[PDB]
Write a protein that binds this ligand. Structure first.
Ligand SMILES: *[C@@H]1O[C@H](CO)[C@@H](O)[C@H](O)[C@H]1NC(C)=O
Length: 147
């Protein structure tokens, strides 16, 4: 049971939209959320820092394997953040109108809860650099995670 991050680096200009993506390979509930963190030597995605004033708890989803889930219209409208899990193990966070305060190390956490004492936690890490200089790209440049 594991998480694939297609892309480890996203380099976007201010004012763009970006979707950060994690993909799930593998009844049971899932807890899935997003937070900014840091890339430690032995542990990455431990510390849970806010994304634009919201926390992993605000952005979290809780859904069954036959189920999709997304954050509310009022969250999207108010914070320009949409977190969404489709039926195909695609888990994403869509950020509207990037500012330089959006840069950071983003983590998707996915918890498989098979039972009260049976939780498996997996995370994916990806950097978002929001650029502001004359050389900033016209839209997101993205760097694959692998091969
Ligand atoms: C970002 O997304 C919204 C759709 O919610 C759209 O109105 C806007 O044109 C988009 N901005 C860019 C730069 O694509």
């Amino acid at each position: 049971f594991k998480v694939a991050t297609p892309y480890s680096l996203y380099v976007c200009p201010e004012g763009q939209n970006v979707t950060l993506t994690c993909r799930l390979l593998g009844d049971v509930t899932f807890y899935k959320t997003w937070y900014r963190s840091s890339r430690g030597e032995v542990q990455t995605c431990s510390e849970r820092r806010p994304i634009r004033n919201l926390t992993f708890q605000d952005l979290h989803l809780h859904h069954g394997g036959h189920q999709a889930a997304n954050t509310s219209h009022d969250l999207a409208q108010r914070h320009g953040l949409e977190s969404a899990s489709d039926h195909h193990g695609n888990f994403s966070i869509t950020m509207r109108n990037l500012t330089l305060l959006d840069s950071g190390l983003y983590c998707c956490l996915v918890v498989e809860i098979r039972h009260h004492h049976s939780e498996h936690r997996v995370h994916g890490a990806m950097e978002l650099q929001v650029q502001t200089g004359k050389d900033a790209p016209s839209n997101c440049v993205v760097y694959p995670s692998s091969s």
